[PDB]
Design a protein around this ligand. Structure first.
Ligand SMILES: *[C@@H]1O[C@H](CO[C@H]2O[C@@H](C)[C@@H](O)[C@@H](O)[C@@H]2O)[C@@H](O[C@@H]2O[C@H](CO)[C@@H](O[C@@H]3O[C@H](CO[C@H]4O[C@H](CO)[C@@H](O)[C@H](O)[C@@H]4O[C@@H]4O[C@H](CO)[C@@H](O)[C@H](O)[C@H]4NC(C)=O)[C@@H](O)[C@H](O[C@H]4O[C@H](CO)[C@@H](O)[C@H](O)[C@@H]4O[C@@H]4O[C@H](CO)[C@@H](O)[C@H](O)[C@H]4NC(C)=O)[C@@H]3O)[C@H](O)[C@H]2NC(C)=O)[C@H](O)[C@H]1NC(C)=O
Ligand SMILES: *[C@@H]1O[C@H](CO[C@H]2O[C@@H](C)[C@@H](O)[C@@H](O)[C@@H]2O)[C@@H](O[C@@H]2O[C@H](CO)[C@@H](O[C@@H]3O[C@H](CO[C@H]4O[C@H](CO)[C@@H](O)[C@H](O)[C@@H]4O[C@@H]4O[C@H](CO)[C@@H](O)[C@H](O)[C@H]4NC(C)=O)[C@@H](O)[C@H](O[C@H]4O[C@H](CO)[C@@H](O)[C@H](O)[C@@H]4O[C@H]4O[C@H](CO)[C@@H](O)[C@H](O)[C@H]4NC(C)=O)[C@@H]3O)[C@H](O)[C@H]2NC(C)=O)[C@H](O)[C@H]1NC(C)=O
Lengths: 207, 206
């Protein structure tokens, strides 16, 4: 019986409208003893339930049980810890997993736009770069938009630990060289705990 | 037990100056169940001690008998399959792990250097950027230099899969806004299998 804890997505805890959740997954719950008991703790409190919500399923030759705990944006942002306790009769002792945002003071991310290299504008498509550095924790979200709509041909590198101990990454948007020249303006939106309304934005054009 | 094979460092297979090596790491070997044996096979051949060399342990309460094999840059680059065959008493059966380089037509990388952003010109330090895309496989080594001398304060994002099945990454050198003001010239070095002479170098400056 294995147990994996999953944290909410970066955007979920940054937007009051979204719904952030902590998910507890248990794989390899034998066919014989499919009983699984979940106990949830938020800073060690709640052996007595909470929102909670399990379901039940069947796979290869084992069982999979998922429990979902909705969390409060500020509880997560305030570093609270979430414990999932999985008890199974076919287990020597209960298995406990715990997760939260990384410990450390939140640093504001610096977002810069970077136009393509002269030596690339000789190809049908160029690269519009968006540098995001000095942020912490690593939880973060990046997106691109040219006009009132998303650009879907871009990639973001995963965050990287700088010498600072803060985090940095690069998102690369790929545009038809023809567009970038038509004077079009693009922008990457970065969402982080340390940004004003959990959001800043930077423009990039050909002027 | 628990075996894990590791491929050589990209930079090692691209320059004969260095020696590539397939490192076989076995964890959690018991005190009462030591005596760890090895066996390396390159494309089937070699069942008897090849040119290996393993030793050293001690951990959290376990072992870890790490074996090491010397690789031939050509052998690896051509895709020969390296097979580590561990054998232990406290192990139900003979575990195994193989590995060869990522298969597929290699693709030379494009290297572009970028100036720091106008907006970043407000800090006591700036960011010299190096973009690298269109390369396959992902094994790649990126370094920075200034008039012959090495740069230490730089970080490189790992290889990321782009839409076309090729990879790209970014390297970032942190330098004093002054050095960039003085007009110094920095260079981005890229080592890859598909580059002529396994090496290309791009420059940037004010
Ligand atoms: C019997 O069947 C079961 C189901 O199999 C399914 O597969 C298909 C092919 C078919 O066979 C059918 O049977 C089923 O459809 C098998 O269950 C599997 O069991 C293994 C355990 O051996 C699980 O492996 C773990 O996977 C997680 C990641 O899982 C996420 O992503 C998967 C896609 O890649 C996806 O399939 C998963 O469902 C899950 O998705 C997430 O789900 C949540 C909830 O819905 C969502 O909110 C997310 O959005 C969603 N994400 C995405 C993307 O979709 C992985 O994290 C685990 O790795 C960690 O742990 C390893 C130790 O075991 C360790 O080696 C790793 O390095 C890694 O370590 C972690 O490192 C991080 C930092 O990076 C630390 O923070 C962690 O602390 C640390 N972990 C710890 C605590 O050690 C691991 O690989 C597998 O997910 C599961 N399959 C599914 C699906 O449930 C079963 O194995 C099989 N055989 C038997 C009998 O076992
Ligand atoms: C007792 O201590 C031991 C060591 O623990 C450490 O932390 C504390 C406990 C300390 O007290 C101290 O003991 C020690 O510092 C524990 O052993 C540990 O066991 C785990 C699980 O087996 C190991 O994790 C695996 O790590 C692999 C990567 O190893 C490299 O990277 C790590 C960190 O990144 C580094 O520490 C290692 O040294 C190693 O680094 C490489 O070393 C080479 C030689 O030195 C060198 O040439 C390389 O350049 C260097 N590279 C780096 C990283 O720099 C992962 O590969 C493993 O993941 C695979 O396997 C798991 C299954 O276990 C999969 O779930 C996972 O997905 C992945 O493989 C799958 O997915 C890939 C991706 O798609 C796919 O290709 C595969 O086909 C697929 N197959 C598999 C296998 O599933 C693990 O994470 C851990 O490293 C090891 N400890 C160390 C540091 O060696 C004991 O557990 C502990 N107590 C116990 C329980 O006994």
């Amino acid at each position: 019986p294995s147990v994996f804890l999953f944290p909410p997505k970066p955007k979920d805890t940054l937007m009051i409208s979204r719904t952030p959740e902590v998910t507890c997954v248990v794989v390899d719950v034998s066919h014989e003893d499919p009983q699984v008991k979940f106990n949830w703790y938020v800073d060690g409190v709640q052996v007595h339930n909470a929102k909670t919500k399990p379901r039940e399923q069947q796979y290869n030759s084992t069982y999979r049980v998922v429990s979902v705990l909705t969390v409060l944006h500020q509880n997560w942002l305030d570093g609270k810890e979430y414990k999932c306790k999985v008890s199974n009769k076919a287990l020597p002792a209960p298995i406990e997993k715990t997760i939260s945002k990384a410990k450390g003071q939140p640093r504001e991310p610096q977002v810069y736009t970077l136009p393509p290299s002269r030596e690339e504008m000789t190809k049908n498509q160029v690269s519009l770069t968006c540098l995001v550095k000095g942020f912490y924790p690593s939880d973060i979200a990046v997106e691109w938009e040219s006009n009132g709509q998303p650009e879907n041909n871009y990639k973001t590198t995963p965050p990287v630990l700088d010498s600072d101990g803060s985090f940095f990454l690069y998102s690369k948007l790929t545009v038809d060289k023809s567009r970038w020249q038509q004077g079009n303006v693009f922008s990457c939106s970065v969402m982080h705990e340390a940004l004003h309304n959990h959001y800043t934005q930077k423009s990039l054009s050909l002027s």
